[PDB]
Amino acid sequence: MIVKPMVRNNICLNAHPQGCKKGVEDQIEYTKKRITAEVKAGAKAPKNVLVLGCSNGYGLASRITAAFGYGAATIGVSFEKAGSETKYGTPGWYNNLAFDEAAKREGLYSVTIDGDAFSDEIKAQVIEEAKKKGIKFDLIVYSLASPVRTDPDTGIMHKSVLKPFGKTFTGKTVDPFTGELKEISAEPANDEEAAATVKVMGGEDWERWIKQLSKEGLLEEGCITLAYSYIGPEATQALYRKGTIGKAKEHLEATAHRLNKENPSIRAFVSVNKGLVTRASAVIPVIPLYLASLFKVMKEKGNHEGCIEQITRLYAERLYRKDGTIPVDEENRIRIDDWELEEDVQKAVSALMEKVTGENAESLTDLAGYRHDFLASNGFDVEGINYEAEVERFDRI
């Protein structure tokens, strides 16, 4: 049948198999052009990489950059739903298929483990595969993105929330598909939601991954491990700084800190990345309007980045530099949101957000870019795909 996007409750339910494939291929093509012999010259390189949350976003870009930019062997872990002949798989499933197929063609070692990365079973499968091939990891990318986590020690499921503390957080927002400006709110959270959010979005599982791998002797001396995060603009501080998200990030930072203390042979960092369209963006106040404005400003300035641009820059200009350093802020965090949080960028975005109305939104902001990023995450609206051609089956390509 002809596959078109199906969005319900601000979520794209289905996925285009060929579109997802093309999306992966485009990132690979960029990486080959971005990470050249000259960029790599005189710098170290990853060899054995573990990527947790490898099927989309920053995780996918991290695996692609490591594999197709540096030639590294990668083990990827993600929790997908398989396609089947008549029903849809998750976009990450098709992405993983595209990646492994491309990696095989290049002659690269690539193994994808599908399952709950929060579980000890999945960790066991990783350790087993690593033991089998004599692999010691020198780079571990933690990019897990889930609203829920089942505690491996208790079996209790925890649900994260995106809410402030004390007062209700209210701000403008925009529907990129209709162009309508709205006013939405996030109610203040309780102690349970706060603890649960830290349980899900903090650094517990990350540290658990590291400690288990270290115990099995699967970490190379000086192994780099990163957990991706976000700080955001002043307008959203009520959530990302002082909200439930803010507490989770604080736990993430304290975790990277504790990791370095107990493993003198390791290099752990929180990597603060730029803002991007995510599954949860739609329900967050301010965020969609900010991002649409941010995309507009940064594309005009020439410093706009997507996932693959962000991560290739991360590898080339932070992790593997010719000077052998790893630049961090005053809190020992890697910052690649540095272009986003430039004063000239933030002032332009702030001025832009104040001028946005229902009549000028499509013209004043990059609603087009927002729609593309939202759709491309599921394989829709990507260049070079017919879309008027029908998909024969959904368990392939």
- Residue 58, marked binder: yes
- Residue 249, marked binder: yes
Q: Using an 8 Å Cβ cutoff, are 393 and 86 in contact?
A: yes
Give start and end residues of each alpha helix (H) in the chain: 17-34, 37-40, 57-70, 91-106, 120-132, 191-201, 204-215, 237-240, 244-262, 287-301, 307-314, 343-355, 361-364, 367-376
Resolution in A: 2.0
Q: Using an 8 Å Cβ cutoff, are 43 and 323 in contact?
A: no
CATH architecture assigned to 1-397? 3-Layer(aba) Sandwich (3.40)
The CB density around residue 106, as the number of other CB atoms within 10 Å, is 12
Could you tell me if residue 179 is left (phi over 0), alpha (psi between -120 and 50 degrees) or otherwise beta?
left
* DSSP string of 14-43, one letter each residue: ---HHHHHHHHHHHHHHHHHHS-HHHHTTS
Tell me the two tokens of residue 201: 């979005």
| β partners of residue 181 | 174
* DSSP string of 173-210, one letter each residue: EE-TTT--EEEEEEPPP-HHHHHHHHHHHSSHHHHHHH
Tell me the two tokens of residue 240: 């990302």
The CB density around residue 109, as the number of other CB atoms within 10 Å, is 14
Q: Using an 8 Å Cβ cutoff, are 143 and 57 in contact?
A: yes
| β partners of residue 8 | 11
- Residue 243, marked binder: no
* Alpha carbon distances (Å) from 10 to 276, 291, 371: 16, 16, 12
Helix-strand-coil split of the chain, %, nearest 5:
45, 15, 40
The CB density around residue 208, as the number of other CB atoms within 10 Å, is 15
| β partners of residue 226 | 141, 269
Residues labelled catalytic: 240
- Residue 87, marked binder: no
